Each structure stands twice: as C-alpha cells, then as structure tokens.
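Regression check, calcium ion case 2046:
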Amino acid sequence: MKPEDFRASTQRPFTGEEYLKSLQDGREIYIYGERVKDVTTHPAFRNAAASVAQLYDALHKPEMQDSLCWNTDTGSGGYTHKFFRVAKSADDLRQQRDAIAEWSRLSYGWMGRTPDYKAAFGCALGANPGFYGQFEQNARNWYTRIQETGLYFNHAIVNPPIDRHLPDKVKDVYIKLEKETDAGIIVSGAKVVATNSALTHYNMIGENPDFALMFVAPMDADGVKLISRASYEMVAGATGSPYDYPLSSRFDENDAILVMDNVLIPWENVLIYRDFDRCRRWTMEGGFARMYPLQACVRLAVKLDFITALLKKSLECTGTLEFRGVQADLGEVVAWRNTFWALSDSMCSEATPWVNGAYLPDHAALQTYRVLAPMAYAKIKNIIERNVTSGLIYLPSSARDLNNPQIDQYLAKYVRGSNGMDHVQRIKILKLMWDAIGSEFGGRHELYEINYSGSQDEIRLQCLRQAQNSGNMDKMMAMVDRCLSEYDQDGWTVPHLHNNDDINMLDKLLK
Amino acid sequence: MKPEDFRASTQRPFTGEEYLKSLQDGREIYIYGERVKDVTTHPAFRNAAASVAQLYDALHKPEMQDSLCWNTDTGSGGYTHKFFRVAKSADDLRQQRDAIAEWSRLSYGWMGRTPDYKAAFGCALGANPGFYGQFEQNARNWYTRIQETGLYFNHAIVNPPIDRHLPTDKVKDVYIKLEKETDAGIIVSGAKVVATNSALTHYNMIGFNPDFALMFVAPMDADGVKLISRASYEMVAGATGSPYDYPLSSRFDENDAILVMDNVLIPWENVLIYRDFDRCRRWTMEGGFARMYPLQACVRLAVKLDFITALLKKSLECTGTLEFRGVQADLGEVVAWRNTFWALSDSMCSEATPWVNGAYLPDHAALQTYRVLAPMAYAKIKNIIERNVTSGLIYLPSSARDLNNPQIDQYLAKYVRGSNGMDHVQRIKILKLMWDAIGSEFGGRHELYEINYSGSQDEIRLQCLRQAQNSGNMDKMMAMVDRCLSEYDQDGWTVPHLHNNDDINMLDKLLK
Amino acid sequence: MKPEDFRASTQRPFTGEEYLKSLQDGREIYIYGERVKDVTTHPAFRNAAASVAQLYDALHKPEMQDSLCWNTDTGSGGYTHKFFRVAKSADDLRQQRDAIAEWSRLSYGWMGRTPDYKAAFGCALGANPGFYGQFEQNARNWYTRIQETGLYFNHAIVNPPIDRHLPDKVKDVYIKLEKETDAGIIVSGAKVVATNSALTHYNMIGENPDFALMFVAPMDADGVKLISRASYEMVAGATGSPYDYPLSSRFDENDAILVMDNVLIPWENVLIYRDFDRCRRWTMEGGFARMYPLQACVRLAVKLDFITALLKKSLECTGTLEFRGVQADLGEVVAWRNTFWALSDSMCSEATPWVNGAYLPDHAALQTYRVLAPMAYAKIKNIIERNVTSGLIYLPSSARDLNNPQIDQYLAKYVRGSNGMDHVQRIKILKLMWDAIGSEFGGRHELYEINYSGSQDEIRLQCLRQAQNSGNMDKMMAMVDRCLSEYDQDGWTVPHLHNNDDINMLDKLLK
Amino acid sequence: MKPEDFRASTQRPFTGEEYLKSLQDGREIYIYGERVKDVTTHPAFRNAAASVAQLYDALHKPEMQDSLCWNTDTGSGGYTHKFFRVAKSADDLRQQRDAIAEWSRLSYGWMGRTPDYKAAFGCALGANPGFYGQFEQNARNWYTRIQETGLYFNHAIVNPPIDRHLPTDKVKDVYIKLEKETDAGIIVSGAKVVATNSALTHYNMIGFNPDFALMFVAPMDADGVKLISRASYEMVAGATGSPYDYPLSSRFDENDAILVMDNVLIPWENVLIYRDFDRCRRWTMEGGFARMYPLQACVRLAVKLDFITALLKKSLECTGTLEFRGVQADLGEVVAWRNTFWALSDSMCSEATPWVNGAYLPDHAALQTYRVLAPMAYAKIKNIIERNVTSGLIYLPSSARDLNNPQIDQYLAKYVRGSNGMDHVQRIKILKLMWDAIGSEFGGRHELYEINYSGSQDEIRLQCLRQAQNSGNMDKMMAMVDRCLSEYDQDGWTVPHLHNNDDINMLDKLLK
Ligand SMILES: [Ca+2]
Ligand SMILES: [Ca+2]
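Current build output:
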C-alpha cells in the first residue's frame, strides 16, 4: 500500500489522522537496542508524530486556509500547502514565505525538518524536469504526487566516516550502485543526519560512476533501516514532565543514521543515474539549493520571535531588565530576530525568473542567511546564558516539587517573579527557557543551527562563489576599477579635482 | 544674498559650479590656527568641495538624471533628487533607495554626510507640517525651499562637554540657549560638536528651562556662526602625499568640526520649535526624520561595502593568498555582510507603512537593525582585511615619487610584482587604495565614524528594543510564547493531541 | 554526633568510607517531590558521593601523599591536604597549587565544588582571626577543625529573587536574624546555587543590621533544608549508561536552593554579628576572595587539559584534523588551556606577605582568571561545536545498540574512526565529548563557568577596582603622566628631540 | 670602519652619541623618491634615531644601570644590557624580563624592534655555537661582539612577492640566493620585506637548490645593501603637525622597509649556515632564537598595555563616561588583558628549563600563548577604546596652532573642557595622545603590526598546537583522557567505587 492511499480524498493532502495511519507501515527503526513496532505509539516518537499531524490538520481548517493553501496546478481540482507548488512570481514567493511561517508557528520554530522543507525539492522537479533527461517523466510524476498528497519527504546527504587504514572496504561505505536489473537498481551504503526520517514517507538520496546517483527511497522498502540517536522525547517523558521539558516532550526530531542494505529502487524512483556531469551540475542547476533556504530562514525567524519574547519574559522574572546593559543585550537579540525576517523579505522582493515561468528567491539573501545564522544563534545563546546569571542553574527538579506542599511552601516564598508573577509561572517560564538552550534538546538545537548547511568555511565559500557566479563581484569590481582609473602615479586623470603641485612640500623639504 | 539665488534657473537644483559659488560667502571657518579665506580654494577643503559639486552636476546629466531625479511636487514644473520629495508608496521608497545608491557611488560610499542625508529632514517638514503649530508655514516653506533648490543641509546634534566642577551659572552657558527675543527673531548662543562637513553646507538644523527647548535653521554665513575644524586628511595627503598614495583622503575627507554660535540672530522664518519641551521630547518619535534618514545611511554603507568587498578581492589576488581555503572563507564572510545591508534596504522599502497626509515611512525595525549591525560588521570586516593582507600593507613604498625615480623603480619592478601577474605599479596602487580605506588617518576616522554613527553601543540596542515594544512587535512575539505556555501546566498537557507521560514516567517506581 | 567523630583517628582527615558514613545524618533534602533518605545510596547522589569519597581516600595513599599532604600546623602531629593549611611563602602556594591539581585530576576537572574550594575559607579564618573581634576564638577553632578533619564546607551566597510588588514580606526572603538567645541566634531565609551542598558537612552563610551576618550552619541542623534541581546522575542512570553519559553518571554536583527555617545557630558558629562595617570590609580584608580563585583557576586548567586532548581525539576520529583551519582551531584551544596554567604560575610566583606570616596569591592574576574564564569557555565550546560538524548529532542512542548484533553490524561498517579506531572506541570518544558540552550536564557546566563568580560587568568592575586599590593604576598613570610632561603646545620639553620649526610647512602653505 | 670602533671604551656598549655617529656611514636609504643623506638629521628618521640613542644612554645612567645591566661573561671586565648575555637560570630570565621592561618604558611600549629584540639571536649563537659546524667560531665571535658592544641587530625574514606568470628563470632571482663563492666570501642577491627600523640598525641577520639555503650577517653600510622606505609618520607629523598633535608618531616611528641586496659581498666571518637545507630546516627548532625572542615581545606589549590602560582611564575621566557601569566594565576588561601579558611573562621565567651548555630557555608554551592571544587582545582593546570614546576623538581641534591663536582658543576654553575639571589644553592633549595611539596612520600601522607580528592567524595557532605535541604536553593531556575512558566500557564501570545502573535503568521495562 502507498502512503497516499490512506487519504479518504484525492483532492487534498493528508489530514493528521491519515498521516498517522500512513506511518504504521512496518518501517525498520531501531532505538535503545530494540526495534520500534509503531512510531505513532512508541514513547520516543509519538508526540513528535502528533506534532507533525497537527500541521496536516491545519491545512483543512477554514480559518487557516487563506494563509496556508492554494489550489494544485495539476488540474486535479484539489488544494495543497502553498510551498508544495512552483512559485511563478515574487508575490507567489511572499505568499509561500507566509504559509511556511504559519506552519512553523505551530512548533514555535522548533521543528526544522517539517514536510515543507523538502517540498522545495518537489518544486525543483516540477519547475525543471527536462534537467533529468531520460528521467524527466519521473521528475514530473514525483512533483505531482508530492504536491497533491503533501507527501513527507526528507533527505539523507551527509556521508558516513571512512577508516583511512582499511584496504576495497573503503568504496563500500558510501551509497553505491551494486546491480542494474529490469525492475530497477540495487543500492547499498549509508547516510548520516537523517533528521526526523522516522516520521517521513520517502527520503531523497544524492571517478567511479556507480557513486553518481540521485533517487527516491520509501521508508518501508526492504533493506531501508534507521539507527536512532538518544530520544529527548522519551527521556523527558520517563524522568520529567511537559512542565519541566515543554519543548523536548513534543518537538524532538530524531537525527538518525539511514542504512541501505541491498535495496531495490524501481526505475520510477531514479532521477540521476551513473552521471557525474548531472551530479556536479545539480547544486547550481537543480533548483533545490536555490529554494530550501527560504524555508530555513523563515523557520529560524519564527524560532527567534519565540526566543526574543521568552528572553524578555525571563528577564522580567529575574528583575534584571531594569539594568541598561541587560536591556542593550535584549535589544541585540531583537536586532538578530529582525535580520532574518528582513532577509526573507529580500528573498521574495528580489526574486528572479528561472525556467518555464518559475521564480527563484534572491540567491545572495539565501547565502547570507546560511553565513549569519550560526553566528547569530551562538551569540543569542551566549547573551541568554550571561543574562540569566543564576535563575536557570538552580530551578527545582520537577513539577512534583510544586505538587508537594512541604517543598511548594518554600518555592512560593523564595522563588517568586520580580515583576509580580507567582512561583509556578516564574519556574514555568525559566524551565521553558532552559529547555530551549541548556537541556540535551537545547544543546542539539545549537549544534543543528551552527552546522545545518555545512562547515563555517564551506558556507562562506558558497557565499563567495554566488557573488562571483551571479556577476555581483564583477559589478563591485567595476566600481573599484573606476576609482583606480581616476588617477595614476602622475596625479588625477579626471578634470574636476585639484592636483597637489601647488601644495606638495616634499621637494622644498628634501632639497 | 540667499544660496538659492546662485541658480540661473528656479526649475532645478544647483549645478556644481553654482554650488561652489554659493560657498564663497561670509562663512567663518578656522583650521590650523588660521581663518579660511575661501573653502573652494583652501587646500584642506577644495577637493571635498569639488566632490560634492560632482553630485550636483550628476543631477543634470542625461545618463544619470533617470535614476536620480523626479519632478517637484510643488507645482514649479522643475525637478529634484528623488530623496528631496516626500515618498507616497513603497515603490517611491525603492526609487529613492536607488537614487541614494547612485549618488553614493560617486564617492564609492566614502562621503557620509552628502546633501541627501538631511534631505529626509526637509521631507519630515513637508509630510507633517502641522506638528510645528504656529511654525507650520515655516515647515511648509522650508520643505519647498530644500526640495526645489537642493539646499545642502546638515546638523550638529552632539552637545559639547561640561566641566562638572564649574558653578551652576557657567555650566548652562555651554549648550544652545535662547539669549533674547526680538521683533526680527531670536538671539542664540552655545555650541554643537561633530558638525561633519559643515564647512561645505548651506544651512544647519540645530535641535535638543524652556530657553534650551529650541529647533531652528541656521545659515552657515550668519554673523556669529563659526567652525573650528579638526585636522584635514585632504591637506595632509596633498602636502606630503599624492592621489596615488592617498586616493580617498585626497578627495572625500568630510571635516568633523565644532559648530560655535556666538549671539546669532535667527529670523522668525527659521524657527521650528520655540521654548517647547513637549514638542522637543516628541520630535524623535513624531517628527519623521529619525524614521527616514537611516534609509540613506544603510544604502551609503552598502555602497561602501560593495567597494571594500571587491577591493579586498583585488588585494588578495595581488598577495596570491586568495588560493587558500581560509582566505576565501574570510572574503566570503565580507560578501555576506555586504549582502546584509542591501537586503535590509530592500526590506525598509517593501515593508514601508502609510504615515500622515499620504506619506510613507520605511520599515522601522529594519532601520534599527541597520544601526545595531553596522558597527559590528564594519569592525569585523576591518579585522578580516588586517589579518588577511598579513604583510602587503605595512611595507608599501613611501610615494609615487619612488615609482617616478628609475633608480628606486627598477627594484620595485623586480621585487614588488602582483602574484596574479599585475605589474608593480598596479599592485602598489591597489594596496595603497586598501590602506587609505582602513589604516590611513582617514581610514581610522571612518572606523570611528561607522562604529559611533548613531550613538553608543548600548543606546542603539536600547532603541532597537524600544521600537519592538512601541510598534507592538514584542506583544505579538509574546502572544506566541503565551500560547506555548497555555498548552501545558504542572499536571500535564492542556491540549488533546499530545500524550501524557503517566504510562512511561518511572520516578514513582525509582524513588521512595 | 559531630562529622569528625566518624574518623577512627584524630591525626588525619576522613577516609572515603568515614566521609560516606558521616553523610548518613538525617540531613533534610528534597528531589523530585520526595525526601532523600540517604545521599550515599540515593540514585541522584550516590556516584557524586562516591567521587568525593575517592578524594578523601587519595590523602591516605603513600604514592600520592608527597603531592597532596603536609603535616598540620596545629601541633596535633597529624596530616592534611596542603590547601587546608595557611600558606607562608610563594613556594607554599605553588605546592598547594599542585595539590589542588592532583585532586582535580581525579574528576578530570569536572567537580568544581570539592572540599579544597572552601578550605581557602578555613585558611582565611586561621590567617586573620583578629578581624572577627569578639568572634576571634570561633575563627581559630573553625580553622583547626577544618584543617585536622578535612571538613567539607560549602557556601550559599546568591540571594533568592524578590517580588517588587509585595508589601514587610520583602524583608523576610533574605537571610535575617530573627532572635538572639543565650545558646545562639535564630535565623531564617534562603540562598540559591548551593552547589553540591547535599554532600557537605557545613555551609558558610554570609540599613537594618539584622541582615549583616556571617555564620557556619551544619547540614543536619533542624530547619536546614535543600530543594534540589534535576539530577543528571539519576537521569543518566535511569535512561542511559556510563558508556553513554560518562561524566553525568559520576560528577554531577546538584545546584540546590538552601532553606533556613527558624534555625538555631550556636554562638560558637557566629563569625560576624549585626555588623555592616565588618560585612562590607570582609571581601577586601577577610582573605577568602583573595584565595579561592587559585583553586578555581587550577580546577579549570585541569578541565582544559581534558577538553584539549578530548577535542584532539574527537578530530582524529572525524579525520578533519588533516585540515589547516581545523588544526588552527585546536591550536587556539591549546592556547587557552596554556593561559590558565600560566595564570596559576603567576598567582604563586608573585605572591605577597599578608598578616601573621601568611601569603596571598597575586591578586591581579585572580581577577584576570575571573574575567577570561567565561570568554575562553564559551569560545572553546563554540570551537568544538563548529569542528565536530556532524559526528556528535547522530551518535547511536545507547550501549544497547552496540550490544544488539543486528544494529552493531552496521555501526562496525559505517561508524569507524578515520584514524583506524573501531566503532566502539569512536562512539565512546564522541559520547564523552557530547557529555562534556551538549548533554544537560554539559549545558549546566557552561552556565556554571560563565556565571561562576558573577555577572560579566561585575567581574570586569572587580578587575578594575583591584588595579585601582593595589596602586597598579597609579603606576600605569605615572608612565602616561611622564609621556604627557615631555611636550606641550609649544613643542618638546625634553632636549634630546628635534622640534619641527625647521620642517613644519603650515605657515608657508596657509600664507 | 666597524660600528664598534665608534666607542671610546671597550668596557661598555655604545652611548647615545656614539650610536648616532655609527649611523653616519655609507648606508643607502631611499624615501619619497630621494636618497637619505644622513639618517640622524633626515626629517623622516631623526627623532626615531634620537629615541634609540636614549636607550643606549640609559645603560650608563646610575639610576637605571642597576635594572638594565650585568657584567659581560666574556672576561672583558665590561658591562652590557642583561638580555645581551646568555641566561643560566630562571632568576636570570626574570632579571632579563625586568631589563627589557625598563628599556621598553622609555618608548612607552611603542618601539617594537629596539636592540634587545635581536639580542636574543646573539644569545642563541653564544649558547649553542656547535650547531653551526665549520662556522662555530663565527657564532662565538658574533656573540662576543653583540654582547660587549650592544650592536643593534635586526632581521628581514619575510620573502618578497613572486609573479606566478613569469618564467621559472625570473621567479627564483627574487629570493636571497648565492651568486658566487670567492676567497674573501660569498656574493648574494635578492630582497626581504618588512625590514622594520633597518634604517637605524648596524647589521641585519638574513635567513631562509642549496644556493637558497643560507644564513648570514650583513652590515647596513655594505655595498649593494639598499632600503626602500614606507611613508614616514615622523616626517608627516613634523611637516603638518606638532609633538602636541602627534606625540607618538613624532618620536617612535619604526620605518617598515624593503631590504634589497644587489651583488653584496658577505665575508666568510659573517656566514653562519652555508648551502645547507638540513641546518636551515632545523634552525627554528634547534637554533634557540625562536625559543627566546617572544619573551622580549610579550614584555614590550605588556608595557604598551600599561600605557594604553591608564591612557583609556584618563580619556574616560575627560569624557565623564567613567561614571557609567558599562564603561567601567569595558575599562576592567582592558585591565584584564594588560594583566594577562604580565602573567605570561612571569610564567615564561618561573617555568624556564635547562637547554645546552648551562643555558636556560623561557617556558615554550607561554611564548606560543603570547603569540596567539596578542592579536585578539590588541584588536579587542582597540574596539573597546573606539566604542567608549564615542565623540571625543573625531572632532579634536586641528592643531596646537588653534590653542596658540586667542581668537580660536577662547572658544576651546569654554566648550572643550574636561568633565573631571581639566582645562581644555589638558583635555585635548590626552585625547590627541589617545588618537595617535589608535587612529593616526602610526596607530593604524601599530594595529597591523600587533595582529600580523609573528605570522598569520592560522600559522600562530598551528605552532601553538605543534609545541603542545613536540613537548610531550599533548601526550600527558591524552593520558588523562585515556584514563577516563579506561574507567568504563559498554557493559558499565570497570572501577569498583561506582554504582552500576542495573538497579535503576528503566529501558527494559519501558521498551518491547
Ligand atoms: Ca561672516
Ligand atoms: Ca654605501
């Protein structure tokens, strides 16, 4: 059974209930040395699964449909989330920017790999299917399927480590073509950082041409397996509570290892085959890399709306918000929050036509978001840590402490909010702040924001390459060349400026 | 004679020639212990004056007029720089953004107080004249005047220091204060500091016991108006250097002066706020100028960053270090900062809101963001340049005189070539241009200017916070946090879609 | 029964066994809404208690005694840890510096509030007992007791928050004298950030003179209670393993709220009584503030030895240590690690005589350590996070994954060390790094290092005040004043320099 | 005539007068397209020459001799600066540290290439002469010479740029290379860049196909030795300023030149390494100099930070902002950085280790730490100053000529007073001193110098890592991590004092 067959109607994406039923497919997932029977009921994934299901439910609410949905461009007569359909103007991109922000607000910016992230990949297939040559019809069909059903795609792109001392064994670790058959291709290898793949329907995977592949793999195919990292949702449930870990308990996106063990990929799922030329050209010509950072920038901007107000609430509680230096530190967090919204505005207003009527967001703004976000996030976290100087480190252990009157009587007296809040509300706000930055979930989120789109050198190199490839550097260079042409070793070459022959005193001085 | 009377036509702003003639008035400027006889010929100001004159000439050039000008809204049938006329849409602001960029490119982003800077003040007077009460007609007339003529306004806003040990009488006399009220106007005395490029301006706007609660326009040639100049990088570059050695110092120096007002008569036609503490306190928020000028400043910086970015790339091509991954990454970060200020200027226009009388204001959050980011970005970009041109800047031959002496030149031709194939003349020229941008006294002054531009580091951050609070932005962010908090309590979830931990919590079994 | 009565001998401090027995005293501690019966057996404290007991055991090992111990100066004929006795030379301080480093190495620098931290307070009482006036004999007796027994002292100094809108109620939150009796004083209030107080014997607590107090409070006195924060030791035990959380499982120092509810403090335990003059003078004259940062700097330097080598091991595993930029980032961590050792060298070599033959470490070096440590620690953590770009975020969940052959077979193939390490060793190293920086314990440690001795402005202000009070600023100022005296508005005032009258061209130019 | 023959006595180093006479030789220096006739009288070098002469005079002053000098170890019965004689204990290094600080205080930390900088090279030759093989006696004789006379040595180590597009023949001719071997010595050609203060030195040490594998001593007056100077901040300050306006530029400028060697004859007595790639590669690690000079550099910077710290405090007293908590915190951080470099110099001496022939070397880890921290600390301190003197530096009156003109001076007396009660003359003087330290072209050059001092940011960090590895420090840190790892495995603790989690782990009960 195909995931899309769980829908009661072919004219709309999944509802939350249909999405949850579609995950009960015998996918192979491991956590804590055991196989997961059902992701929708398992204590490590059930609330994250319920959080994603809320996004699907919002598409069917009349009050949210103007902001979230458009009709499909397929002629099916149905509707879809705006970011699942190819943008054909700067205004289309702005409407998609707002639809992404509306979905991101349902997780307060904490879910980074929701269905709209890879919906940009579906749009890349639909806008430029001709790029894939003999696999053009696969690109067209996959765009149609993703758009109409609201299929939850992810990607597994980071390669696993290689032992430099191994013999043959080295060329077996990476995703490699092992056999070509009539039904399709047989593949083996692994990809790391398969973020929230336990809750997805499909994963896109991308001098020996056997390594030059791009294909779609279903989460329930024989040989497809996930090896999970520690679950902050399960730990928060087993040893904490929603009051103590309000983000860990519902928004944890498990960063897994995606294993492919002798997996048959049907020809209908192949996009690039034994083609080093198309693989090298895909980052620049495919469209996806020129589209997804719009989603990521908006998602971060929503998370920064949350962090900014949460920091203000935390400082109202500590009473340090009265200090000039504290207000200045909060003001800088506000400036960073404003930056990411302004970048998303520029991404849309400066959008350019691409191919087949499609529009792409401003490429310089996408690269800028990638460079600034790790620095802004690390700086904002340091600002929070140095401003809530004492308030976070000694928080009572549990909601159980508030529910024990022998303990609660002291918390009511000694842990009140400076701005008049009762102890229950003060502790609640500070626990929410701690889960955002210092819990294992908070620590993982920092590592995620810093390393998301690559190393610090790599993101800066790609920002430079974009300025060069777009012609931006040539235009900046033309201005410097003009400045240089206006003078030489003999003086000005322009008539409006005064030469120094009448005022230079060096001949008279050095005579 | 009024400065506008130097124009041969009432249908356009000054040409460069007319602007230069208008500066040959009774202005009283001191530098190096001497009174300046004529700013347009004096070795400390002549090239900076010639650089501003080029901006005026560009307004009348067919190849530039399309990007720079619009017709006046006064019914005169004339034209003006787009930023001298009130914006009435988001598209109007984008056109003004482009017109500012075109003028800023004529100085490669190095002149920060050109006439378009205070043209936002003229627009503030025109958009909201009713704010000034009995002085409403002065606001209307000044808007008309500035717009049609392209008058070069400036301001001196920073108060001078006060000795805390002097009597209460002596400390009060230092600030701008009303001395006497007459039939012709008001008599004022005091001083303002950081009167950047006031030597080349027509008028200065001066603003904040009601005798201290004033806002007025003062001509640069009024009796009792005097400027005490700082050291001239233009004059030093001319006397001991050359355009080759100091290519920016020699033409774009904007002298940061002390503006003195010694018993100056201000006619009633030039008064905007009079003995009114309420209007003075309300002006930053309601006047409009503070909500307009950072659009000019952000664009000006973005143009300077276009210049610095490519100049850094050229310098690294010469040193040959551009082949290193870490060097390319450092240049990539400069590119990201350059991109940021352009993206902020895009948002300022696209997110513009209606104000009063059909006027539009740029996005206020984006103006505050530019003010906070610019000092950090500029200091970081300068550090990136310093640590990447590790040797190339410090030993540059002294002078174009070294290149013009064959005995010295023959060794420079052999040992100081560009790594990318440039001859020594071009290699030294590029690196001297980079040094003038960052390490010369002009380069050092520019860093101090970009860092301290719109106030202290705490003040700019406080104003960014105040804007989020006053606009309702903080209330909306707070509504999202309040919604998160309402979804659970000390007993569990308050929303039905999430699973409570009663079936998995192990603390009862573990404890007791 | 007194803690010291648990020792089988009066001529040596506690052994580990005797220290553990001494904690079974009916102290009142809460965690997870429940009373703790015994800290030595409770799942939230038992390993942290066992870790402290190892320090006591090391004092009795012949192989460690040259580095750890000296004879007492009390005439008892016994021995003690070197830092529990007053230093009387620069060499004494250097020997105490080495003894602190030896004890700190037993927790790899992760235990910040071990008995040697407050041993500096015992030494402050012994070096200057005359400061306490009528309480001089209490200072002498407490120094003797702490030194001979190796009593585990802590301090509770951070005040709890105050609700600005409360009426009377405001002046009840802080530690305040409520009654003066023949036996002693009655006190009430609370102190926050009582780090590892669950494992201590005593805590030192320090216009209305009822608030101007300094006294010693036993952990088992009626009305003395601790309200604990979440236990990373218990969470690591319940949902993890030593392999998964190797630091959280044995070095967690619980940051508690210390409550004093109508506590009788006997006159023998009072050090400063209703004396605003002595309270204000104590930071500058007491000695403790001029002593404890030697312990803290050494402790951090040991933690940086650990982090530096752990980062190198982690980069060997990822294989990125081959990159120039990665080696430079590691080199900076090395430079920070070297700084804190160099500061501890200067603290000892530049030591000055104080009172009664006692020596104090260099005060400028103590203030410098306090300013630099938050910046260095935040920077080192950012270096680690941006250099282990992928390796930390997807680590398999558990030692249970390695013990399941179905999962282990893929980890053996795809998660090997780049430098030839097997997957078990690669995962182990990276989990150790993650527990140091990203676990909740790692997050708490960052908050601790940043905020330890106060806000960022406060530590910088105290560094400035030290330069001014010591005469250092006056000497730097004398050099600037000399530079200024060498010229005036007319030229040089010194004869060796050439005036510019023969070369100044301004008269000729401006004529 | 040899430079040492200018001394009236063989029992002491040069006096200031004798040092100045020794510079009036055949040295060939160019500046501003002209050959310098006499460095001691030329307007670009005369005060820098006079500043170095004061250091030599201080060696013979009773009030300073106690801190600066020791007897020679040569048996001559004379004395020398402590840093010119091989250290044979940790206490010897502390005494040399203090002698360096005393000399550095005479320039307030602004002269970075004074004679004590390369005196560490003389000590490297004396401590390990056997390293040089057949040139061992040259090493011994040069140590004796440098120590007894106080010869001013320097080095030019940075190679000049090479055009990558030139033929393999042309690119090779650029670097220092052996041209011919004769009976008298060797003929060399090539160039070195960043020859800081070479115009005022006696000899330069020049070091790294075996023709390129050389180390030798070259006198500044040898035929074919030429300097091409950078712009002179001393001359510019003299021609267009005054000591009041530029108090550091006017006396402490160390010109960063290009050192050219055109068919120079180097006598065999001056050769140290000849056509030996093995000795050239080993010299950084085994020579001793690289393990000695950073003690001088760290002390010199620490003295400059004593100056900057108090100068910042004086400047903030004048602006009156020192009353603000955030301003006091910013000054407190500058104090912490100043304290760091002194603490590093203490550790360099107390942790000194024995080397060869009884010689001691400062702690190597502390030298590498100083190199990594100094560029970050200096850039941060400069940013702190710039953002805290928000207005005070940018508008300073142009000249002492303004104070000497009563018409201008009367307004400065009223409007430019110090907030702490200082008169305008003292307020402007302090702020001009601060500006010359950070924003003048001299201040800009000093920032570039401190940042790029001992190499690129990656290179200094790599050398810090290599030192931890080569010394065994990394192995010892690794032994601690290996011990932590050995205390547990995938089955639990391997140590008996800790409790395993079998009784509390809830995963079996929770899963399956
Ligand atoms: Ca006049
Ligand atoms: Ca000669």
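Comparison notes: The domain at 289-470 of chain C is CATH 1.20.140.10 (Butyryl-CoA Dehydrogenase, subunit A; domain 3). Chain C touches chain B through 13 residues (CB under 8 Å). No diff flagged against the previous build.
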